[PDB]
Amino acid sequence: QISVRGLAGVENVTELKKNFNRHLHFTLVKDRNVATPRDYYFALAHTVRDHLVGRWIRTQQHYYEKDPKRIYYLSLEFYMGRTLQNTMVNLALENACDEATYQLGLDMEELEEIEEDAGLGNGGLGRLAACFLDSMATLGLAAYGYGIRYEFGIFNQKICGGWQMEEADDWLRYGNPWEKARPEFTLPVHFYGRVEHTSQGAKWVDTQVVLAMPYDTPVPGYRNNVVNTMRLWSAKAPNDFNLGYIQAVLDRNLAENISRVLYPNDNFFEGKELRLKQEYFVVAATLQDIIRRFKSSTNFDAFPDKVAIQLNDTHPSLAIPELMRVLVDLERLDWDKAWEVTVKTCAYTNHTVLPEALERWPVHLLETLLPRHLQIIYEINQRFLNRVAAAFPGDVDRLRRMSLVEEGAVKRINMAHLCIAGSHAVNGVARIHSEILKKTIFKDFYELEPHKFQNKTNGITPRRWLVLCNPGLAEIIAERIGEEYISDLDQLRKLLSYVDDEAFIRDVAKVKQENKLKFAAYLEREYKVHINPNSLFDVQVKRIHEYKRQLLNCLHVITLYNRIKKEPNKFVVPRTVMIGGKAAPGYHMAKMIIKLITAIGDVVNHDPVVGDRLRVIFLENYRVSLAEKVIPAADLSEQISTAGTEASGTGNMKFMLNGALTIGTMDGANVEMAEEAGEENFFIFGMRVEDVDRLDQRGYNAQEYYDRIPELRQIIEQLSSGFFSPKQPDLFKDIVNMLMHHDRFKVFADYEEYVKCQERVSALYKNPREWTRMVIRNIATSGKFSSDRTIAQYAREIWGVEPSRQRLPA
Amino acid sequence: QISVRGLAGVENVTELKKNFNRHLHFTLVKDRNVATPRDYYFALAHTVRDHLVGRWIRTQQHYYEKDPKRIYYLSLEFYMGRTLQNTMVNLALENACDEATYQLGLDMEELEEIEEDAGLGNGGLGRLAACFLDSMATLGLAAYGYGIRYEFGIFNQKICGGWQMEEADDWLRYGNPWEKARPEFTLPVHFYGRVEHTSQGAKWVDTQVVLAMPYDTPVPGYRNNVVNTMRLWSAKAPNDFNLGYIQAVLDRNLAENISRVLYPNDNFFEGKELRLKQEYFVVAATLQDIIRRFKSSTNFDAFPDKVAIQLNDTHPSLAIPELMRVLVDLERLDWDKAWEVTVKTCAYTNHTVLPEALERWPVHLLETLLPRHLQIIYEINQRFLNRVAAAFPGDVDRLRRMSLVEEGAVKRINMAHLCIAGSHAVNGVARIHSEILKKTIFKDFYELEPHKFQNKTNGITPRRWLVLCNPGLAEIIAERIGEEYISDLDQLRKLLSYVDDEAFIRDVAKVKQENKLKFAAYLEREYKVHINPNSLFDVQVKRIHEYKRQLLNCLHVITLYNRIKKEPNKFVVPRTVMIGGKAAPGYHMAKMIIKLITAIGDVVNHDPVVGDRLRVIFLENYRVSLAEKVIPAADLSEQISTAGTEASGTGNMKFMLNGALTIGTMDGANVEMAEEAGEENFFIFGMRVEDVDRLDQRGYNAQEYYDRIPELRQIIEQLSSGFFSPKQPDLFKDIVNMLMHHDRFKVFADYEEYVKCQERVSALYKNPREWTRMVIRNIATSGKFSSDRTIAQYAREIWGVEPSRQRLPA
Numbered sequence A, B: 001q002i003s004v005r006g007l008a009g010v011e012n013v014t015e016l017k018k019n020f021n022r023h024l025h026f027t028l029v030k031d032r033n034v035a036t037p038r039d040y041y042f043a044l045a046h047t048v049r050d051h052l053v054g055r056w057i058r059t060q061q062h063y064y065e066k067d068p069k070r071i072y073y074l075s076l077e078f079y080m081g082r083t084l085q086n087t088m089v090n091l092a093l094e095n096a097c098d099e100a101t102y103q104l105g106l107d108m109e110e111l112e113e114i115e116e117d118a119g120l121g122n123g124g125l126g127r128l129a130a131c132f133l134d135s136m137a138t139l140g141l142a143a144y145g146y147g148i149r150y151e152f153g154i155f156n157q158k159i160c161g162g163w164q165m166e167e168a169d170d171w172l173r174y175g176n177p178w179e180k181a182r183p184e185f186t187l188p189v190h191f192y193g194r195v196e197h198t199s200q201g202a203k204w205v206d207t208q209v210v211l212a213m214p215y216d217t218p219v220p221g222y223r224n225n226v227v228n229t230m231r232l233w234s235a236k237a238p239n240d241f242n243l244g245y246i247q248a249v250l251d252r253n254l255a256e257n258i259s260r261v262l263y264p265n266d267n268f269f270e271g272k273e274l275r276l277k278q279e280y281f282v283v284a285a286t287l288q289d290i291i292r293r294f295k296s297s298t299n300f301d302a303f304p305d306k307v308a309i310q311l312n313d314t315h316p317s318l319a320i321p322e323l324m325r326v327l328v329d330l331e332r333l334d335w336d337k338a339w340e341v342t343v344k345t346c347a348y349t350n351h352t353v354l355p356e357a358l359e360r361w362p363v364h365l366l367e368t369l370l371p372r373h374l375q376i377i378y379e380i381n382q383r384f385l386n387r388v389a390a391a392f393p394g395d396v397d398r399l400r401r402m403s404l405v406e407e408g409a410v411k412r413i414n415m416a417h418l419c420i421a422g423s424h425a426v427n428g429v430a431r432i433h434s435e436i437l438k439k440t441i442f443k444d445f446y447e448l449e450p451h452k453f454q455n456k457t458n459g460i461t462p463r464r465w466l467v468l469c470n471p472g473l474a475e476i477i478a479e480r481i482g483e484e485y486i487s488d489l490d491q492l493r494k495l496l497s498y499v500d501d502e503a504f505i506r507d508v509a510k511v512k513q514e515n516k517l518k519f520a521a522y523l524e525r526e527y528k529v530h531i532n533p534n535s536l537f538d539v540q541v542k543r544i545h546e547y548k549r550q551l552l553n554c555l556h557v558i559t560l561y562n563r564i565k566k567e568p569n570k571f572v573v574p575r576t577v578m579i580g581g582k583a584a585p586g587y588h589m590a591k592m593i594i595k596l597i598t599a600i601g602d603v604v605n606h607d608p609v610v611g612d613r614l615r616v617i618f619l620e621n622y623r624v625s626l627a628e629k630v631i632p633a634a635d636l637s638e639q640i641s642t643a644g645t646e647a648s649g650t651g652n653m654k655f656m657l658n659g660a661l662t663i664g665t666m667d668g669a670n671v672e673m674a675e676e677a678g679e680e681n682f683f684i685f686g687m688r689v690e691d692v693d694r695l696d697q698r699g700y701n702a703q704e705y706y707d708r709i710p711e712l713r714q715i716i717e718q719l720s721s722g723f724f725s726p727k728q729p730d731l732f733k734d735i736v737n738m739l740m741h742h743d744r745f746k747v748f749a750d751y752e753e754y755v756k757c758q759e760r761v762s763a764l765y766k767n768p769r770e771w772t773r774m775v776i777r778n779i780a781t782s783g784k785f786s787s788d789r790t791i792a793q794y795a796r797e798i799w800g801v802e803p804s805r806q807r808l809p810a
């Protein structure tokens, strides 16, 4: 039907239909009289999976003949979402499958909705690892993602009486057609034990053993016939485990618990033993697999020429002392040579400067769990601090700031300091975030080794985040400029010549309106919720966290409502304010923010005086597949973190690519986006990083703002006196207290500029044609934010390998 | 190659090869350069499985159109062994697969050895359920076996320093190609809670819920295109389970533990809570599935016309009060009508008279776990005892003997009494065992309801237990009489006309010698063990239990050794004495017996004076696939339980069918076997049941035998003084003590007749031609012991349905 969806050849369509019927019979053991839509989903998934396999085997065979340098991306998170449509997109099968299933009397979109998300991540750091895998495959790199196959991913969020409830995300319940278990490549991982010193060096003994069993999932490049591997480890007890006979068998659960469940905190460190086991487990299994693959290519000098390991934040930072352990204890390399190899192999990406998000593990934990790694870490530390001492003689304070060991209450290991010492490259994830690292938290390290520090601004894949979720837009774009932009997103610049083209203006706006109607209807079907699709769709979707300032958005919504109640018969641009995202289970403030949002909707949505001029909707269970629906439907993207706190953001990029305009602070990647599109085509407001620093030197006093802004004082008194909670007038006193006395994120300080910037958005929205022309200028300069650009810079500037756009043979 | 293995058609062979290559590529995602023999096994299994599926769908469709009465066989055990060769046998695919794999350069026998046994049973009661499923399918009955999918089956037994060690049987580790998960038919099962009485009757509330998820395994009939279903339940937590968030997710293991592991006690009751949960779980899930299937055929009068439920011992006896619960509480039938339906639906098979093997559950357990079922059981009891009182007025002792509630220390429920009250038919499993039930433990019930009591002598399937494991013998038989005997085992009688036929005599003995060489070599390959294949293969294989009297066998072995040491230069018929079987983990006496056996082998096998005239081998890890190898190789079958204690035995039947002669007591089915072949063609010795009773009245005094039999006293002094345990002279004092002071099974009493009967066996073995003619007379009268005969009598005499040998269309 639409051209970017590929060819529906007579031969291909006939083949698909017969393979579909074959899997329904032989794989699912069903016939058409008894098959449910779920059976039909599976028959289609197995049919599409069959097309991957030849390419998968051929790709891994090619890497074996050519022996290129291999890239290993280690992450505790891979937030993959659904796989069926993505695989059709990259194989150019979408129109053929659509034709084939329509001929069998099925609606392929209905079947797509049955697939569970693979929710193996929390938010932007896990989704970044997913876009990156897609980009590495599209650029033909010999790349493997390594992680943990969690049996339960991020929880499903239900809202009850306006509060978040969590329920287990049992995503494997019906099976997962995309993974292949590889029980034959199972590997042991050791925990506890003790260290013995021999004349022959150290030996780690009396350990408990857990087995790591791999499951491989294919990752197709965009039409290049490349299929790389995502290898995820599952924990298994050994068979003589303990071996009541009955209790000994039931206790095998203790081992297997390692891979049971994703820790749901995001941008917040919890120093729990089970989380540390998961970190060491992924690292110990992955490095044996790497060294094995390297040996089947004695001489470890060539290791860094044949291997790169990229650490996704500090979560796999144990790779560094584990590599040393293997090289020194097992392979008997001397320390200095082992260290040289390690540093040249590893690189570290940082994704935060929030102090609560930094991993600092108690020494007593590492001592019991990983006694040999703590000894290695002490030694790394001693030699590193001898280099600091030589470079800055007498600077005893620098010695204590830079140490890997933090002195104090409980001694801890600063995992970020360890990564910087044992990596040849450290990067931040947006230009302002990388500059902040050099000037504040890693300033001492930068002074020591300036050449290690780099920037790699984040990106998103344009396959998932345009072609897949917004085919209407990808299509009016390809009509004018062809299809090559899908893997060369810079070509979108050519659209700047269409900014005054009347046909284009109208098509861009027609596509948005269609996305809006489709999403308005999804809301009613799947949630009985009623919206005006003519309203401006004002959307803030991301994890709930105080730094993201969903609370500033709430204050704006209450101001708009109060203004209406004051002058009811005045005209206002109608809005649908949608806010969604999950809160970590013990992050009390974040759960209270969810409750506030729904409590506002309760008042605002049933006030007859408002009518349909204002609606506040909490979008439940926000996750990758929900992103794919709401993002194409949005007009306005809320990116309103306090300057200096959103390291990059990526949701911001998705919205820009999909024809929403952005209201935001000069934070993270928002700075580079404004610079690409021009500041006149973005709605920037609020303190810059400099302004935040100046307010901190003086002292932030929220009372000052409350005293000087009568619209703000009114909202606070409404919150305090029970206006939004009539049956429990003091429900929101923790929120008021925090805003009044300990707001780390200065919500009041940005309030006036934010409300005034929102009036400018409403003014532009009144003029459809100039709103759309500014939209065009955003889409057209979104090219820099493709993850293919990001990954080509990692390849060239960190990994030392060349991307490639050439097809492997079909 | 051999004719009972079917046709190797050019078309069929070409098809198999291409389907094999297809599964290797698309299913296993491998190519020939990297595939291991395990990959090859799986590609062949998937290829054979594909031939089942059309027949499976067609069979279940046929039962839906025809609506026959359905038979439900409820067992906690299905001891299935391997499936690949069995499926080839019943589909007539064996020679074609053999040809196909040979053409691909593979040895199909080597691939067969890779498959794990499905070890979902302990011994004869679980294996009986497996032979029965095969027979129900071959006779075309609409039959479903229902059980539990244990994640760990019976443990793997290793021997270390002569002691049994147990290790977990992780049989699912590589996946199971034969099962299909059916997550869409998942059902809730309730535990704990409390009972509320309403005006509308009773209600069971505040329960914890566990989900039962079914996995279906196909069960092919012998060349009739029938494929029935074995449906096994797996335990799953619900998703809001509890729902630390992390602890709540990890605690889902508590629910799932129900289906984790098979209880490894056999013929011994352990009253553990987890075992009771497993019993109720299988029963509650199965009956909802039955009632569902019955409704999709309001009027429960026709329920017994459309449903039979067969209870395999008392393990699923909760079916009776669960059926009442459903009918009374949920369907609102009145009690009397519900009771009529129940009794007409259920039938109970007993498999023991050992008091330690009878289930008697503590009331306090049922009270907490299943409060409504205990109330139902009290009510059943009260009404049943009102009928006893009316029939035997004033007989207060009869009232207390017959009650379902046993008074005492802890009140218990006698589950056997409940089964008899709520079933229309009770059967024992061999004629002497059924007579014993009527005369001793169920005598009171028989007097009340004589018409309930029946016999159904056990049998074994001739597909697994002749065609599959002994193709050489099935082939020389089919040459003379054709192939029809495979599903009409009575036809073996025709072989009696070949008893003096010289060609036949020689072929029967050639087949045995070949089985013996093949097994001698298996011992060296897989176990470095060295045997004389010219020796008489004297084999005792079965679970270790005092009633089976592996100890009597040991005494005979020590007597033979002592006789050799006394007259070393005398001629003796050389023997290989093989004993194997598993001991339950806390059955201390049984583990000591294993240690004794290996300790005897240690002495006997390295005494140079013995040479290779005597060898004692402990066969490790005895299980269905090991049975299939040793049984065709045996000359002499040891069936030596104390008269009145082996309810039937089935291993005895396997050996008879495979050309071993039997030495045995007049116990269980041995009585009917001797009667079929003629007593002159069996080696019967020892007390009859009558002799055992007479000795019990007088009092058994083992000292008397020790005092009067100098060969027996010598063995005892050897045991006591440390002859078989030099480094720990008192290792065996518990065994001596038991034999001397508390032998429930009278091992000494049968000792003299046993040793003398063994001299007669050795005398016959000296004359190959008359040994073989007596072999022929055994094989030829083994027909009655086919499970098709057993199942045709259940069908006609209990279930009220007619067997059928007709093919469904291909």
Ligand SMILES: C#Cc1cn([C@@H]2O[C@H](CO)[C@@H](O)[C@H](O)[C@H]2O)c(=O)[nH]c1=O
Pocket: A122, A123, A124, A125, A126, A128, A266, A267, A268, A313, A351, A352, A357, A429, A458, A646, A647, A648, A649, A650, A668
């Ligand atoms: C440490 C750390 C973390 C960083 N990020 C996100 O990582 C994303 C990809 O770099 C950034 O765009 C975003 O600014 C940042 O908050 C997370 O989503 N979770 C974290 O725990």
Ligand SMILES: C#Cc1cn([C@@H]2O[C@H](CO)[C@@H](O)[C@H](O)[C@H]2O)c(=O)[nH]c1=O
Pocket: B122, B123, B124, B125, B126, B128, B266, B267, B268, B313, B351, B352, B357, B429, B458, B646, B647, B648, B649, B650, B668
């Ligand atoms: C109760 C009970 C049991 C009975 N049988 C066996 O059940 C077999 C099949 O009926 C009999 O042949 C054999 O004599 C008997 O011991 C078992 O193997 N285990 C038991 O727990």
